[PDB]
C-alpha cells in the first residue's frame with residue numbers, strides 16, 4: 001500500500017468555502033437593480049439584522065489580525081456609504097487603506113478527516129436547483145433522441161446536487177474577478193460572491209456568500225497573479241477544527257436565529273477571512289466549471305454505451321430507472337451521478353500539479369494490480385508518492401487508492 005506523509009493535519013486551500021459557506025438570500029428579486037451584483041448584495045445584507053460589533057475569534061497565526069478586522073469594518077462602512085448615496089453605483093472601489101494595502105500585498109501534512117467530509121457534503125442533494133434543464137452541452141445542432149434522454153435523466157439527478165452549486169458559485173466569482181481584473185486594473189474593487197438558484201416551489205433566489213476585494217491587477221500573461229481578500233459568512237465555529245483554518249483569520253460578526261429540530265435557536269455567525277491569489281488562466285478554468293457537468297455525463301454515457309453493446313439494445317432507460325447487475329453499490333443511480341460529479345468538481349476546485357501527477361501514475365499501478373489480481377515496479381511507487389505532500393484532495397484519493405488495494 002501507499003505511504004501517506006506524517007505531519008500536522010492538512011488545511012483548507014480552496015478559493016472559497018465549500019461545506020462551510022453561509023448564504024444570505026432574497027427570493028424572486030425585483031428591486032430597482034435586479035441583476036447588478038452590488039445592488040443584490042446590499043439587499044441580501046439588509047435582510048440580516050443580527051450584525052454586531054466584530055472581533056477576532058480564531059487568529060491567523062502568520063498574518064496581521066488587526067488588518068483583517070479593519071478590512072471587514074471598512075466593507076460595512078463603504079456598503080453603508082452606498083446606502084447614503086441617492087443612486088446605487090454599479091461597482092464599488094474601496095479606499096486604498098493601510099489594512100487593504102497590507103492584505104492585498106501592495107512541508108509535510110497528514111490527511112485530516114475534513115476533506116472526506118467535504119467530499120461527502122458535495123455529493124448530497126440540496127433543496128434548490130442550480131442549473132436550467134438545457135444547461136449541459138454546447139451543441140450547435142439539436143441533440144439526437146438517445147443523447148437527449150440521457151441528458152435529461154442525468155440533469156434530473158444532479159441539478160440539485162451540492163457539487164452543482166459549487167460549480168455555479170465558482171463560475172460566478174471567477175467571471176466577476178476576471179472581468180474586474182481587466183476593467184478596474186488599479187482599483188481595490190469590492191466584488192460580491194453571488195449565486196442564483198430556484199427553490200422546489202419555483203421561486204428564483206439570489207444568494208450572497210460574502211465578498212472579495214481584488215488588488216492591483218495588470219495581468220499581462222495567463223500566469224500573472226491578482227491578489228485578493230476573501231470574506232465569507234459561515235455558521236462554522238473555527239475552534240472545532242482549527243487545523244482546517246491555518247490560512248484564515250476568523251471573526252465573529254453577528255448572531256443568527258435559526259429553525260432547528262429543537263425549535264428556534266440562536267447561533268453565532270462567523271466571517272472567514274484570508275488573502276489569496278489567482279491568475280488569468282486559473283480564472284478562465286473557473287469560468288469553465290460547467291464542463292464538470294458534461295464530463296460527469298460522459299462517464300455515465302460510457303457505462304451505458306458499454307452495457308448497450310453487450311445487450312444489443314439501448315440500456316438508457318433500464319439503467320437510470322434501475323431495472324446482469326442487481327443494484328447500485330453507492331445506493332442508487334442518483335448517488336452514482338452525484339459522486340462522479342463531485343469528484344470532477346473537486347478536481348477543479350483542488351486542481352494541482354500533485355493531482356495531475358498522482359492521477360497519471362496511480363492509474364498505472366491500478367491496471368497492474370488488477371492484472372495481477374484476476375490472473376494470480378518500485379520507481380513507479382516513488383513517482384506516485386512524490387505527489388503525496390500536503391494537498392487534502394491528493395491525499396484523500398491516495399487514502400481511497402489504498403482501499404482499492406485491500407479489496
Ligand SMILES: Cn1ncc2c(NCc3ccc(Cl)cc3)ncnc21
Pocket residue numbers: 042045046049051052053054076077079080
Ligand atoms: C445593531 N446593529 N445593526 C447593524 C449592525 C452592525 N453592522 C452595520 C451594517 C449592517 C449592514 C450594512 Cl449593509 C452596513 C453596515 N454592526 C454592529 N451592530 C449593528
